[PDB]
Amino acid sequence: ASHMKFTVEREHLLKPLQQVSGPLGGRPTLPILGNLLLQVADGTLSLTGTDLEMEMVARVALVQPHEPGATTVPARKFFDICRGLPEGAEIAVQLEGERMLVRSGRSRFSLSTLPAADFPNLDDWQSEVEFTLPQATMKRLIEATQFSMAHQDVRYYLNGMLFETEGEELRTVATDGHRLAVCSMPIGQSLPSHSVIVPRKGVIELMRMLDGGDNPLRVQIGSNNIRAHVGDFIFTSKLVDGRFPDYRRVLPKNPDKHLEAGCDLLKQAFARAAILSNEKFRGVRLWVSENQLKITANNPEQEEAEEILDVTYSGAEMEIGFNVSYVLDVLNALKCENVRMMLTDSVSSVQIEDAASQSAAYVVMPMRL
């Protein structure tokens, strides 16, 4: 364990290195958080990156003679060296004193190290629920809602995504207090009930590990941590504390005005109107009348966009204002033929959803224009 050494084909290293460098990046703090932990033992090389809140581990099987041990090495420099070597290269790595040597061909790189003993670990924990699902289903759930997470709200429980198991369904919820997205998908297993908040940076990391086609995703949820296994990777994150809002109480109660329109026509009309909306406040005005929607936008310069669209609507006329970016985010996430908007009045939220599917639902709160 004192003299780590391994030799591995470049192509078995590149994707693991790229993946484990995900939690890394900006804001130097502890020096060793810019490093990857390398551990050789019993036929396996493990590579780990962490930002203290979450960690990503990749396992690479070692075919060739190796000696056990561990060290840490600058992540980006090690990846850039491996990637810069020619296709098919064999990469021989060994600790020499306080340096890590990387050799291939007549190329030699001697990298600085920091001790493996200094590499931070997440505290140990106990999984309460576990389930396995296709990557495509998790990717659905996250893409349907991720845009509605808050970024830096003082309501820190909003800077993340709720993952909820209920019956046979896995559900995601995201909201920033101005808009909410919820999506649920069947999992094919009866699950205990759990509701946990994954921090927004963990959502992004989870989601970048779903490159794999058909390798399934195994999820374990504890009281304070979540872990996802895909292929040879294991991702673990802390959870966020707090009582996340109940989407069931956020959905508009009995909206009485039901508008249906083509999703692409509606999206393009809002996108053009947005050009002449206020650059900061983004307000657009919707006027609904018999089978018609009018969208208007004005800015401090007194420029004005107006779009009129034929829609399906029978009901009282009303006017309502929205941040057009929030509406465009919903329409971009729907990707369907027809959308349904369900309205109540000018001061109340609206529900937006695919006219043909109820798997996802969106709620947007209006603006007083």
């Binding site: 101005h178 909410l180 809002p245 709620v363 603006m367």
Partner: peptide
């Protein structure tokens, strides 16, 4: 802009 909660 109004809030949901």
């Amino acid at each position: 802009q109004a809030a949901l909660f």
